Each structure stands twice: as structure tokens, then as C-alpha cells.
Design a binder for these strands. Structure first.
Lengths: 177, 136, 42, 245, 354, 41, 140
RNA sequence: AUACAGUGAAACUGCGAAUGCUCAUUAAAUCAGUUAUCGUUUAUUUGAUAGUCAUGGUAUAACUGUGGUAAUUCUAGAGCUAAAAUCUCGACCCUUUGGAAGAGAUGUAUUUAUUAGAUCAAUGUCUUCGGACUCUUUGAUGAAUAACUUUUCGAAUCGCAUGGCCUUGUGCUGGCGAUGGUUCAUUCAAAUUUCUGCCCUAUCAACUUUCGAUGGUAGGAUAGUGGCCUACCAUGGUUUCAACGGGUAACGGGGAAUAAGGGUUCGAUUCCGGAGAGGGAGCCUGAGAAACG
């Protein structure tokens, strides 16, 4: 089976030691959920004790926040455009923690214009929001960072990027483009 | 730093019966001269004389198991392995050491008395001023 | 490395796991060689 | 093995019961309960071995659920309820109480206790913490979790609790110059005033204690229980004052 | 219609400009059905956590369709409701039906209108016959029960009081929210009658400890230049109660601050209309009873009222010897008080006042 | 079938809930006066 | 360059609002060890991002506190210290010298070269072969 | 007893059933000791702990009966049981027990973002002795929002009060004992983990990257850290203080174990360590199994 023992790595001396015991139950590693994007199908796992751990294998909708003014809504994801671990992962669009996604702009701009009254792009000081932010408002496609383990929580939480974060990720995309 | 601070069960336990050294116990009985609480003759002899009288140790052990009954109010039983072993050993030593109720394996043994005395033994005198203080 | 570097070495469990196979060509290889030359390159 | 253990030999019994070695082959395992097992006393030992009120296990079960023994106010129905250190066992049919306290030889000792002194029990305050709804709860050594305590209660304290209602009454904060009761370590059973403390973060907080032969000695802070000041105990201690001759 | 598929299925197709939208004429046709089912899901009470999340989801879904659509929804709300007796008459209602069922319906309605304003704050519309009549309708019979019923009906009295509170709160919030999207001047008369009817009698000693919705309504009224219409419609009885509250010392700073803020909005904002001499008379009385304030009656409030007095002094439309004696006594009180938490330029504005 | 035993049981348990809820409220109150006293001290 | 790795190397659960302007760009969290040790100003102003840093990372130092002498400093962010201590051989009753070549993660806020009495403290397991983390420096 | 209450087979359901013999030999491995768990899990124990329909639907087993097949402990189809109080001020008295008009508020569980873990009394200084100061001390105070989700919930369950009131309805009301449930603590455990210790041999000087060897960063995975695993990388670590390697008869050793109440060192107990339960491979519950009936 799939274990997470140390009973196979080399010693710090640099030699191979003896086999100790048959591999147990508690030292187990379960099967990795390559969570794709789609019709949300959740699967429950009974872990040690009576603990329930959820693995959603697909999803459309995640919970996203701005701390720019502190709002958070459930929205529909659109796509996977960056992730620091694996280019193949980014390619086949299997979302993970710390993933960079394109997300819809529609309910957020609806709230913004229903809360301020000012059309995006095209409370005055708070209405002067960031220029790249309102450009992505005009584009209708925002950049978010999924910052939650999906294959543990069975949830998908993200926050839309801000200045230096958005700056480095834009630089990453423009260097990789 | 680092240490343990645990209950010294073995040190709070006793070893006096381990270090008892019977010949000089007999002497210190003679010197400290309290009368002895010895028994009468029928209380002594064992089994229509098939065995010896008894040893003085065996008098003590019987008195103590009778005390277990005295307070604890329960007896022993016919448990196989342990009492067969102990009964055999004690009877073999009865037929090989005790003659007429006193024992001589105490001399045929090899436990010395200097390992008890040891020129004051524990917390011994090893300095000249310690000699001066003990002499005064 | 882990597996990136091409450790060219014989494998015992797949030594004769599918060794050998009879040459099931449905061709005689000769006109097909002329034909592969006379493919879209010509 | 596959889990916990349920049988245990006579020889492996903890010392502070002071048993024989061949009453049986297996010892009464303590039930899991309000005291740790390595420091607790089961009632069958208390009522079979020590006070000789009962002499066989079925008999002591018969009395226990004739429902006479009351522990810590409440009544028990366990053959192996884990009574612990500085605790209260009363009995109505003899009209008596017993505060259980450690001796100098590292063994338990009953104390014959009258009704009003048995009305209260002290507790080593382990820790207080802010629970839900922002309320405070205080936890002693013996699983005692009490809402709304004194704010002056800190960790490592001692609180006297009346038992007729399970409610805190009095408190003493450990400071320098207190009447300690040593409970663990090397030097269990030597009761006197403390000297002081050495602090060791990432480590231990040693306590120097000077007992009535004016002898100091060092013990772990975790082994500390607090009684009071010098010359005034809150417990009717027995004769001996924690002195071994 | 399914509950376990409700929210997810809404986000599946009912979300606009996404996957599986509904065509224009068809969606126009199937308005009423969506309206009825969402009214049912709102009428479901939020007695559990799931019902809470359901109600939150319902109100979050609603405002994304279109202005006439949500107007139709509000129209169905008014149609469950009514205003016919009160608005065929001036203010009387012949059928004395103020039953617990009626007020329960009223409270459900004010709950849903609170919900829709809170979700579509700076965007939702205001139809005339849709909001104005039921609001003052419900408030009118709320005060009717408050007046005509003793304490024997604790049930009626409690939920009539909460009905009154919610109606006043949502009236204040809709005033804050729409502002000037529409010509207000249709029912100024009837709404001002029902504002000056119940509470301006005892408005002094009713709310001093806490700010309230009518108080912040008067804040918005005196701050907004178009609601100088409201002020001139009054013979400043509400401003007289405001004088009473600011003279009383048992009033909170959260009340005091906005009052003089709107008073200086009156002061600095000019208007070429009648009763502005009454406005500046009120300003003179406000200076008269701001004399014992600000040192025996917060740093931000001190700085704010300092700036307001800076405005007052810098145009200086009051130049009487009495108001000047008030000004010099206020100056000696201010400069006697502790200003160590103030800054150099603000001190320089006080210096310019001097 | 509904019985007076069931109804008295229901009344009894609801009574227990309201009384110990009230007791919790009293405990909160009495700790509040205690804490007020020991802050005033 | 500080952010030269694949992902945005930042200290998590730390928010900076670009709306209200500030003096230093990111309000950097750092807590105290306690335990007799003092926080360093080099860490307080330290712009490095080390989640294994005992002061700025989210790691706890609770337990053994030892010290050692460094030999090699040729990794990234971690070193190996060698400690030759006395060992007792009772069947000869003779003393001997024995060195533990034990590693430890270091913070960049402390600059350590060969010939350093470094005082370290243990933590929860940091990597495969390390459970220590430096807190105190005395170079020579 | 015209609902039953005694008793009780068949069965539902709760919990236990995780405390069996045979075969293989490891020198920081194991074992003993000592940590840590501001890094985890816990059925059970005890201790606290949740104001947010005079009662809703089901079904079975058994039973009845009819059958099949050489045949199972095989099998068929048919009939069956809304509300609700509480906290915030305060308008008055009436001076006692204060009572209080009218003005505001009211779940947990999941997941994430945000937000949350400088002053004062005098007795002090000064004092003009009245007082100013908290400057200097004696003493005091601190240092939820936004949403997210298969809803978790806030008991449709057993033993006894019989009163009080009049609306005599058998109406209200109520008290003392069991089973469950929310969370936290505690208990029994468990997991890793610090460090301390065990033979002969250089006729063993090399070893590790040839499963990552060493470390970083990120993520998955796990109850939980950690190259445990994958990307992205850096190119390391151990070593004559002999690493490493070899043999060890390692039925070995552990003051592990009671000891030898006087055998010369000897008894008795305990830990061996792992694996197996035709043989490789895979899966399933439970708090705890990689259960091997």
C-alpha cells in the first residue's frame, strides 16, 4: 500500500538498514485526489477515529474574498493559469492550494456598482480602486489565488490578488509568455 | 539541566533481611540480653519426628504467616509450582543442614561478614579528622 | 537523477516478458521502402 | 499489542498500595477515571487490603452497590473506582470520613476525619483558560473544571472547594515561603516551608524547601501542592509532620 | 423547487451571462413564477442555520435581473399588502383591522424590504405607489396600536413596537440610499404629517442614550440641501426637539456629532428660499446652547465642531453683540480647555477665529 | 398514542431546560457582581 | 533578490492594506521566544522570508537548549556543527574525545562563520535530519 | 386488566468479539532511560457544558401459505406490523424589599478572508495645610465582520411526585431517579520524537546520490510535522575520534526481574525482536486491526 513511513529512506550515515515490520494502518498515505474542474462530486473518507475528511474531485464554485474592503462571495471558477509547482498541473487545470486562477467578475462588479454607483473602468476616495483591478473588471476575468487544500477540506477558497502579489504573478506570466 | 525525580521504589524498599548476618545476630542477642520468647517442646518438633525440630528461621516464618492470618484473615492453598518448589527446597535443606534444631550450613556457606562490617562500612572513616571526631 | 537521467541498463523482470515476437509483417519491406522514399517527400 | 492492556500481575502493582505478593496472580486494575492510574487507589484495595472492612471481591461488590460508600460527596458503584491522593472517602453506616494523604515512606495513608472537615476538599489548580462565550474555566489536577473562578487564580495555585455543592470557596497563590506538600519526585513526604524557586524555561522550575529539621532539598514544581503558611495547615495532618525516624 | 438542489441549480442557470441563460421574451414571460417561488422561500422563516443560509442566498440572488422585474416583485409584495383605506382617505382607516396576522404580514414585508435595500443599496429603484404607501401605512397602524392599546397585549405591543422600529429604520435607510434618484416632492405632505404626528412631541427625552433611525433621518434631512424642503415644510418643531436634545446633557456623542455637522451643513450651504432667516435664527439659538458644550458636555468631535465654528466665524453671518459675547465666551472656554492633542494648523484656524 | 405520562415528561424536561438555563444566567450574574467588586477593590 | 523563488515568498496570515499608506511597506509579524533569549533587531528589520526562522517563521522553541561549534557552512540556510565532548570508558577508566557532527538550520539574520560558539534550541522536526535551530551567536 | 404491564422463545437494535500457536535474528537497530508534542488522535472514565408537536411518515424479521432442487446455514415469488423571554438606558417615586414608564439588542457546527486576545485612589510629591499633581511611590485597569456547506444541532426516549388553583377542565402547574446529544477538559491508550547508554575486527577505507544521497522552496498525502511523496532546485553528507564493512554461537541481553533471610554469583519472573495463520495481489468495519478463523 501507500505509506508515509521513514522505514525506507537511507540513514543519515548513508547505508540501507533492515526491514522492521509489515506496514501498519496509522502510517498510511491515501490516494491523491487530482481535483479537476466540473460538476462538483464529493467523496467522503473515514479517517482515524470517526473523523470525516472530504475530497471533492470537481468544482465550479469557490468562496473568494477581498480584504481590500472585506467582502467574500461564492463565485464560479473559470480556469487555471498559473501554479508554482508543475507546468503540467497548470496545463491540465487541476486546481490545488496556492493556485492562480481566472475567476468571474460579474457578481463582484454587481456588488461594486450597487454599492458605489460608479461604473467600473470607462465614497469617491474608496471608489478610486486600483487601475489593473478595474482593467480586469473591464475584462470580466479576475486573477485569484486558491489558498486552500482542496483534497483535504473538500472546499475551494481563494482571494483576488493585490498589488505586489499581482505584480509578481504578472511578471511571472510575462516572463513565461 | 536534566534529571529524573522519580519515586525511588527500590530505595524506599527494605534490604535489612538481605543484609542480616546471622552469627553476629546471635551474638548481639547474647549481649543485648533481652529474654527470648522461646516455645515449648511440643510446639517445636515437626511431624512425629520425621523431620528435625525446626529451624529458628522457620519459627520466624511460621510466626509471620500466622500474622498474615492474624490481620489479613486468609490462608494459602495448594498452588502447584511455587509451593512444590519451596517445600522441596526447604525440606532438602532440613535434611542436609539442620541437626537437632540448629543449623550448620551457615558455616558451610560463603557469605563473609567483613562485607557487612567493612571497617565502619557505609559512610566510612577515611580521613584523620574523621577519626578524631569519631574518637571524641 | 530520480528518473530523469536515462539509466541505460537491462531489466530483469521485463527481459523475456514479451520476448520474442514472430515478424508479423503483411509486407515484403521492399516496395514499402521504395514507397516511403516515394512518399510526400517526393 | 493490538491496543491497551487489561490484565496485570501482582508483582507489577504500584508501591504505594503496600500489598503482599501472593494473594492472587492478577492485581485489581484501576478503572480509568478522575485520577491517573499510576498514583491512584482502587476502592477494592481500600476496603479489602487496608481497612479490612471486606475480605472478598464479591463481598465488597455487594457493599459497593448496597450503595453506602460515598466518594467526593457522590456515591460510586465501581469495584475499581480510582480514589486518589488527598481525597475523601466517607461512610454513613460508621459515620466516619477519611482524607487520603501521602506518607513520608511514599505510601498512602488514611486520616480519620470529622464531618465538617470532610465537607471541603482542596485542589491543585493546574490551569485557567478562556473557553467559549468568553467565560473562564479553571482546571485542577483531578478533572475539576469550574466556571467563573477568581481572576487572582493563576496556574499552579491551590483552591479549597466545598463539596456539598461542588463550589470554590478559598484560594492560595503559590509564592515564596509557603507550606508545601511534596507529592512526587525523589523527596516525597518531607513537608516544610519552601525556600525558593530556580526558573528553567524549556526545562524545569526547581523548588528548594526547608523542612522542620531545617533541611533544604530540591524538588520539581510539578510535584508541588500548596497548603498554606507556616504553623497553619488547612488539613488536620496526622502525627509525624512528614518526619521519618 | 427542490431544496437540496436549490442554490446550486440557481448558480447553474439563473446566474446571468454564463451557462444556460434564459432568452429575453421567455424570461419576461416567466417572471411571475420566479417571483412566486422566491416569495415562498422568503416566507420560509430562518429558524435554523440552513434556513439562514437559504434566506441569505435568496436575497443575494434577487437583485441581478432588471429594474422592472424587481419592481414587479415589490409590486407583488404591496399586493400581498394594501393601502386602500388610508389612501382613499387622508389618514383614516375605517376597518379597524390591526390584527396580529396583519402586523405579522407587515413585519415580514418590512423584513424583505430591509433585505432588498441592504443588497441593492446604491442601485435599487423607488416606485411611488409601491414603497411610500405601505411604509407609512404600517408605521401609522404601528403608532395606532401603540396609542390605542394598553399593556394588556404584550404580544401586540412588542411586535407593534418592533414593526415601528423596523419601518422607521428602513425609511431612514431608503432616504440614505436613493437620495435624489427621483422627484421626492410627491408625498412630502403625507409623509411629513406622519413624521410630525407621533414622536416629535416627546422627541427630547426618548432617544438620548443611543442614536436612532429618526434622529439620523433628521441628520440626512438637514444635511441634504433638497430636504431643506422638509425643513421649510416644518416650522422647525423637529429642530426644536433637536435644540432640546442638544441642551440636555444626557445625550451621546454619537448623537451630538452629526447634529452639529448637519447644522453646519445648513450654515455653509446657502439657498435662495424662504425661512432661511428662520434657519439662521435656529443657528443663533444653536450657538446659544452650544455655549455650555464641548468641555462639560471626543477629540474628533472637538476637531469637527472646531471646523464648523471656523466656518461659522469665517463667513460670520451673525454679528450681533449678543452672539459676539457668546463667541468670546466660547473662545475663552475653548482656549482655557486642553488642546494638547490638537495640531498646528487646526490651532491656526482657532487663531484665525480669534 | 399520546398519554399524560408523555405530556408530563415533556413538561418536565422543558422545565429542566428552562430552570438550568436560568441557573446558568444566575451564575453569570453572580460572577458579574463578584468581578465588579474585585475590580472596584 | 529576496523573491527569487517560484512562488511569492511571503509570510502568511499577514495583511498589508495598500489603501491606507504606511512607512515600511509590510508590517512584519515577529514574536518573542521568551526562555531568556532576546529578539534581534536584525530580525525585526529583516526582510528575509524564512518560515524556519525561529523569530519570524511560525516555529516554536520549547525544550532542550544546547550549543556547538560549526565546521562547515556550505549549504543554503543551514550548517553542520561538530562537538567533540569527553566520553568515559570505565573498563579502562580512561577519558576520550568524541564528536557529534550534528546539523542545524540557521537564520540569515545571524551571520555565522567557522569558529562560532553557537547556542541552539530544539524544535518540532524541521527536516529529515534536523531538529535544532540557532538562537545565539558568539563568533571568533 | 375491554391497550398492555408476570413470564418469555424467534428477531430489531446497542456493545464486546483488537486481552491463538508455529516459523525467521537485528549491535543507535532493538531495548532500557530521559525528553518533546505552541505539532497530533482517542470508543471508555469522571467534570463542566446548548431559550436562538395532546406528537409526522415509515418498514421488517418472525408468522401464514405456496414452491423449487440431489444440496447447503441454498433459494422463489404471495400475504402480512410560528413563538419567546432576556440584556442596554432611563421617566418617575419612596424611602422601603426599591418598582420601574419608555428608549435598544439576542445560536452553536463547517470553510476562508478580515478583525481580537494608555491611566487612576493618597497614604505619594508639593503644600499657602485648604489643597494641585499622578511628575517621583504605596496601590489599581486593559494591553467580531464578510460570507462558504448534503446540515450538526437546540431529546418526537425509560423510574416516580398529587399537590396547588378553579376555568373542575380530569385544566394548569410542578418536583426526585435512567438512556442520549454539543463542546471542552480529564482518564485509558496510541503515534512519532530529544538525548543517554551494548560485543569482536582495519586480515574491513571508503560510503552515500544506481527509491532524495544533503538541504531549500511549493504542493499532495497523513489524525500531525518531516524528501514521507512530486515538482523546482542547490551539490551534498559520514570517515581513521576507523565511518563503512565483516564475523557475533544476537536461545541473546536488559540491577528487566524478585533476589541468593549465608549456593561463592545462584535461583525465580519479565522484555526477546519480527513474521506467519495454503501462496503472491487487492478491498472492507471499528476508538483502536492493514483482523488474515
Amino acid at each position: 500500500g501507500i505509506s508515509r513511513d521513514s522505514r525506507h529512506k537511507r540513514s543519515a550515515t548513508g547505508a540501507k538498514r533492515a526491514q522492521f515490520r509489515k506496514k501498519r494502518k496509522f502510517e498510511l498515505g491515501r490516494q491523491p485526489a487530482n481535483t479537476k474542474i466540473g460538476a462538483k462530486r464529493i467523496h467522503s473518507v473515514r479517517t482515524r477515529g470517526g473523523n470525516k475528511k472530504y475530497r471533492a474531485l470537481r468544482i465550479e464554485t469557490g468562496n473568494f474574498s477581498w480584504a481590500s474592503e472585506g467582502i467574500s462571495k461564492k463565485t464560479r471558477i473559470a480556469g487555471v493559469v498559473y501554479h508554482p509547482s508543475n507546468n503540467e498541473l497548470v496545463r491540465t487545470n487541476t486546481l490545488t492550494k496556492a493556485a492562480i486562477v481566472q475567476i468571474d467578475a460579474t457578481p463582484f462588479r454587481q456588488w461594486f456598482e450597487a454599492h458605489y454607483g460608479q461604473t467600473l473602468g470607462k465614497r469617491a476616495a474608496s471608489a478610486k480602486i486600483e487601475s489593473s483591478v478595474e482593467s480586469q473588471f473591464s475584462a470580466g476575468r479576475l486573477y485569484a489565488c486558491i489558498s486552500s487544500r482542496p483534497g483535504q477540506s473538500g472546499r475551494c477558497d481563494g482571494y483576488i490578488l493585490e498589488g505586489e502579489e499581482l505584480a509578481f504573478y504578472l511578471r511571472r506570466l510575462t516572463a513565461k509568455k | 539541566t536534566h534529571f529524573e525525580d522519580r519515586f525511588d521504589a527500590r530505595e524506599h524498599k527494605d534490604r535489612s533481611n538481605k543484609s542480616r548476618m546471622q552469627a553476629m545476630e546471635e551474638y548481639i542477642r547474647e549481649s543485648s540480653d533481652q529474654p527470648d520468647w522461646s516455645a515449648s517442646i511440643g510446639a517445636d518438633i515437626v511431624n512425629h519426628g520425621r523431620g528435625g525440630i525446626k529451624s529458628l528461621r522457620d519459627t520466624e516464618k511460621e510466626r509471620r504467616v500466622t500474622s498474615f492470618e492474624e490481620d489479613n484473615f486468609t490462608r494459602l492453598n495448594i498452588t502447584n509450582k511455587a509451593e512444590k518448589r519451596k517445600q522441596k527446597q526447604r525440606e532438602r535443606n532440613a535434611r542436609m543442614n539442620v541437626i537437632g534444631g540448629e543449623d550448620f550450613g551457615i558455616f558451610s556457606s560463603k557469605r563473609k561478614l567483613e562485607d557487612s562490617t567493612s571497617r565502619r562500612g557505609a559512610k566510612k572513616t577515611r580521613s584523620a579528622w574523621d577519626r578524631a571526631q569519631r574518637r571524641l | 537523477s530520480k528518473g530523469r537521467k536515462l539509466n541505460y541498463s537491462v531489466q530483469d523482470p521485463i527481459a523475456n516478458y514479451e520476448a520474442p515476437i514472430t515478424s508479423g509483417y503483411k509486407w515484403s519491406d521492399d516496395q514499402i521502402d521504395e514507397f516511403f522514399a516515394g512518399l510526400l517527400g517526393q | 499489542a493490538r491496543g491497551p492492556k487489561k490484565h496485570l500481575k501482582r508483582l507489577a502493582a504500584p508501591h504505594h498500595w503496600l500489598l503482599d505478593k501472593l494473594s492472587g496472580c492478577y492485581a485489581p486494575r484501576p478503572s480509568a477515571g478522575p485520577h491517573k492510574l499510576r498514583e491512584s487507589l482502587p476502592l477494592i484495595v481500600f476496603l479489602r487490603n487496608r481497612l479490612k472492612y471486606a475480605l472478598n471481591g464479591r463481598e465488597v461488590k455487594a457493599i459497593l452497590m448496597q450503595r453506602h460508600v460515598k466518594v467526593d460527596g457522590k456515591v460510586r458503584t465501581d469495584t475499581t473506582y480510582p480514589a486518589g491522593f488527598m481525597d475523601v472517602i466517607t461512610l454513613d453506616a460508621t459515620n466516619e470520613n477519611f482524607r487520603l494523604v501521602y506518607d513520608v515512606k511514599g505510601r498512602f495513608a488514611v486520616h480519620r476525619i470529622t464531618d465538617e472537615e470532610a465537607s471541603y476538599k482542596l485542589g491543585k489548580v493546574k490551569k485557567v483558560q478562556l473557553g467559549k462565550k468568553g467565560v473562564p474555566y479553571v482546571v485542577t489536577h483531578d478533572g475539576r473544571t469550574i466556571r467563573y473562578p477568581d481572576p487572582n487564580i493563576k496556574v499552579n495555585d491551590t483552591v479549597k472547594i466545598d463539596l456539598a455543592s461542588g463550589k470554590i470557596t478559598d484560594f492560595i497563590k503559590f509564592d515564596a515561603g509557603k507550606l508545601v506538600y511534596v507529592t512526587g519526585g525523589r523527596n516525597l513526604g518531607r513537608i516544610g516551608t519552601i525556600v525558593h524557586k530556580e526558573r528553567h524555561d524549556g526545562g524545569f522550575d526547581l523548588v528548594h524547601i526547608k523542612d522542620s529539621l531545617d533541611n533544604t532539598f530540591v524538588t520539581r514544581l510539578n510535584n508541588v501542592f500548596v497548603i498554606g503558611e507556616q504553623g497553619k495547615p488547612y488539613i488536620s495532618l496526622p502525627k509525624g509532620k512528614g518526619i521519618k525516624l | 423547487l427542490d431544496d437540496t438542489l436549490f442554490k446550486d441549480e440557481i448558480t447553474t442557470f439563473l446566474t446571468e451571462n454564463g451557462s444556460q441563460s434564459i432568452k429575453a421574451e421567455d424570461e419576461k414571460v416567466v417572471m411571475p413564477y420566479v417571483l412566486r417561488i422566491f416569495f415562498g422561500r422568503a416566507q420560509v422563516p430562518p429558524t435554523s442555520g440552513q434556513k439562514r443560509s437559504r434566506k441569505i442566498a435568496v436575497i443575494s440572488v434577487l437583485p441581478n435581473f432588471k429594474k422592472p422585474y424587481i419592481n414587479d416583485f415589490l409590486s407583488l409584495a404591496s399586493e400581498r399588502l394594501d393601502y386602500n383605506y388610508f389612501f382613499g382617505n387622508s389618514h383614516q382607516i375605517n376597518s379597524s383591522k390591526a390584527t396580529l396576522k396583519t402586523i405579522r404580514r407587515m413585519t415580514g414585508f418590512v423584513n424583505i424590504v430591509n433585505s432588498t435595500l441592504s443588497v441593492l443599496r446604491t442601485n435599487f429603484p423607488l416606485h411611488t405607489n409601491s414603497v411610500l404607501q405601505p411604509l407609512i401605512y404600517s408605521i401609522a397602524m404601528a403608532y395606532y396600536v401603540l396609542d390605542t392599546e394598553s399593556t394588556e397585549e404584550v404580544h401586540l405591543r412588542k411586535m407593534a413596537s418592533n414593526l415601528r422600529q423596523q419601518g422607521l429604520k428602513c425609511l431612514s435607510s431608503v432616504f440614505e440610499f436613493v437620495g435624489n434618484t427621483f422627484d421626492w416632492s410627491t408625498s412630502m405632505e403625507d409623509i411629513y404629517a406622519v413624521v410630525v404626528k407621533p414622536r416629535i412631541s416627546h422627541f427630547s427625552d426618548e432617544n438620548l442614550q443611543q442614536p436612532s433611525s429618526l434622529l439620523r433621518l433628521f441628520l440626512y434631512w438637514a444635511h441634504n440641501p433638497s430636504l431643506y424642503q422638509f425643513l421649510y415644510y416644518d416650522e422647525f418643531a423637529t429642530a426644536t426637539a433637536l435644540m432640546d436634545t442638544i441642551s440636555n446633557q444626557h445625550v451621546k456623542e454619537a448623537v451630538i456629532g452629526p447634529i452639529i455637522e448637519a447644522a453646519d451643513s445648513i450654515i455653509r450651504n446657502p439657498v435662495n428660499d424662504d425661512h432661511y432667516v428662520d434657519l439662521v435664527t435656529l443657528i443663533c439659538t444653536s450657538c446659544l446652547k452650544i455655549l455650555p458644550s464641548l468641555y462639560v458636555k471626543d477629540s474628533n468631535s472637538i476637531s469637527t465642531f472646531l471646523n464648523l465654528l471656523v466656518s461659522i466665524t469665517e463667513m460670520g453671518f451673525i454679528q450681533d453683540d449678543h452672539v459676539r459675547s457668546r463667541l468670546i465666551s466660547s473662545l475663552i472656554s475653548i482656549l482655557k480647555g486642553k488642546l494638547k492633542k490638537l495640531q498646528e494648523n487646526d490651532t491656526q484656524k482657532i487663531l484665525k477665529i480669534l | 398514542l399520546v398519554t399524560p405520562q408523555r405530556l408530563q415528561r415533556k413538561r418536565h424536561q422543558r422545565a429542566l431546560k428552562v430552570r438550568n438555563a436560568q441557573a446558568q444566567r444566575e451564575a453569570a450574574a453572580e460572577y458579574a457582581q463578584l468581578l465588579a467588586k474585585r475590580l472596584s477593590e | 533578490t529576496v523573491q527569487s523563488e517560484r512562488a511569492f515568498q511571503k509570510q502568511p496570515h499577514i495583511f498589508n492594506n495598500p489603501k491606507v499608506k504606511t512607512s515600511k511597506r509590510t508590517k512584519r509579524w515577529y514574536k518573542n521566544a521568551g526562555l531568556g533569549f532576546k529578539t534581534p533587531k536584525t530580525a525585526i528589520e529583516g526582510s528575509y522570508i524564512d518560515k524556519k526562522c525561529p523569530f519570524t517563521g511560525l516555529v516554536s522553541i520549547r525544550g532542550k537548549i544546547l550549543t556547538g561549534t560549526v565546521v562547515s557552512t556550505k549549504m543554503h540556510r543551514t550548517i553542520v556543527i561538530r562537538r567533540a565532548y569527553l566520553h568515559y570508558i570505565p573498563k579502562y577508566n580512561r577519558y576520550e574525545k568524541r564528536h557529534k557532527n550534528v546539523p542545524v538550520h540557521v537564520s540569515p539574520a545571524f551571520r555565522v562563520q567557522v569558529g562560532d560558539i553557537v547556542t541552539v534550541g530544539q524544535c518540532r522536526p524541521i527536516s529529515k535530519t534536523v531538529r535544532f535551530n540557532v538562537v545565539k551567536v558568539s563568533a571568533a
